[PDB]
Design a protein around this ligand. Structure first.
Ligand SMILES: Cc1nc(-c2cccs2)c(CCC(=O)N2CCC(C(N)=O)CC2)s1
Ligand SMILES: [Zn+2]
Length: 326
């Protein structure tokens, strides 16, 4: 019955004092310098920047006190440019815990021919989401360190996934996209969890996939995409509203809020699709419309909005703490 626990799981909602502590515990300037800027490089699969981004993400995680278990899921696949190597980065607390909240983004950058000595670094797409996850891991390190403490009073922990190969090499298609996520979802579907279990897979273990994509532009509007995650989307709205009321957000208005009541009219393709089609609940934190700079050379550092990202860092960290009861 444990794969059904996610359906009844409740947050442990934090009081004003705790919310102030979280808002002050995260540093947008240290994320910018130590987590974001090293990723603002060309990093399509197999590029020098692909290897550098991987090493940077792993190094930033390994320096933390929490008991993170890093795994690199490396595989070959045919592409339009030819057989390429892809490496997903998985970072897991308590790997044998039956349940994980999963935060994820893609760390590859889309390939574009250089033009006018300009290189696409995909600042929103998705270097900022990578940096946000690393900053969450740092800001919450002491609280996450307590997950190492066995105590029988749920069997639930945190996992981070940095997908490789999200972007098409040529034109987006079922066989020219989602290289890392299609591979990892298939592998997880085939892998018993907990080890030795009968019937249940690692995908049953995924309580909720929170996929960050195209974050960093000013005035993002996130639609509530899915009914089976809508109650969790509403927690993001309530956290945003409460942090704003408490004066803990910068350059933020109620009419210019991020998390929207309405849903979306189409189906966005992204790294969550291979998980969603196999029953995993998904909270797809992608804006609609996409950033103005999307898939242009102007998706760069200069066009990021620091206050927006800082605000979203605070909202995400509260959400994660409340989900995990920390
Ligand atoms: C030419 C195309 N117009 C669209 C759409 C227009 C309006 C709604 S959808 C496509 C589908 C959307 C899509 O392919 N992705 C994949 C890459 C993701 C990412 N991290 O860049 C974003 C979503 S393709
Ligand atoms: Zn993209």
């Amino acid at each position: 019955a444990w794969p059904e626990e996610k359906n009844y799981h409740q947050p442990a909602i934090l009081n004003s004092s705790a919310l102030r502590q979280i808002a002050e515990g995260t540093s947008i300037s240290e994320m910018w310098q130590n987590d974001l800027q090293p990723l603002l490089i060309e990093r399509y699969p197999g590029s020098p920047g692909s290897y550098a981004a991987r090493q940077h993400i792993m190094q930033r995680i390994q320096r933390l006190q929490a008991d993170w278990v890093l795994e690199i899921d490396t595989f070959l696949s045919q592409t339009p440019e030819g057989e390429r190597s892809f490496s997903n980065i998985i970072s897991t607390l308590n790997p044998t815990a039956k349940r994980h909240l999963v935060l994820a983004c893609h760390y590859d950058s889309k390939y574009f021919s250089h033009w006018n000595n300009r290189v696409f670094v995909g600042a929103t797409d998705s270097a900022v989401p990578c940096a946000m996850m690393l900053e969450l891991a740092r800001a919450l390190d002491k609280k996450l360190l307590s997950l190492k403490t066995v105590s029988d009073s749920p069997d639930l922990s945190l996992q981070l996934i940095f997908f490789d190969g999200e972007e098409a090499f040529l034109h987006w298609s079922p066989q020219d996209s989602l290289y890392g996520s299609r591979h990892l979802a298939a592998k997880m579907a085939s892998t018993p969890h907990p080890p030795g279990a009968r019937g249940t897979s690692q995908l049953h273990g995924m309580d909720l996939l929170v996929l960050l994509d195209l974050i960093g532009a000013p005035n993002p509007t996130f639609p509530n995409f899915f009914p089976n995650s809508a109650r969790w989307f509403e927690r993001l709205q309530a956290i945003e509203h409460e942090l704003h009321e408490l004066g803990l957000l910068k350059d933020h208005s109620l009419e210019g809020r991020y998390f929207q009541n309405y849903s979306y009219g189409g189906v966005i393709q992204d790294d969550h699709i291979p998980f969603l089609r196999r029953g995993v609940p998904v909270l797809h934190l992608i804006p609609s419309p996409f950033p103005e700079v999307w898939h242009t050379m102007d998706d760069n550092e200069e066009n990021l909005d620091e206050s927006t990202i800082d605000n979203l860092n605070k909202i995400l960290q509260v959400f994660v703490l409340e989900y995990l009861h920390l």
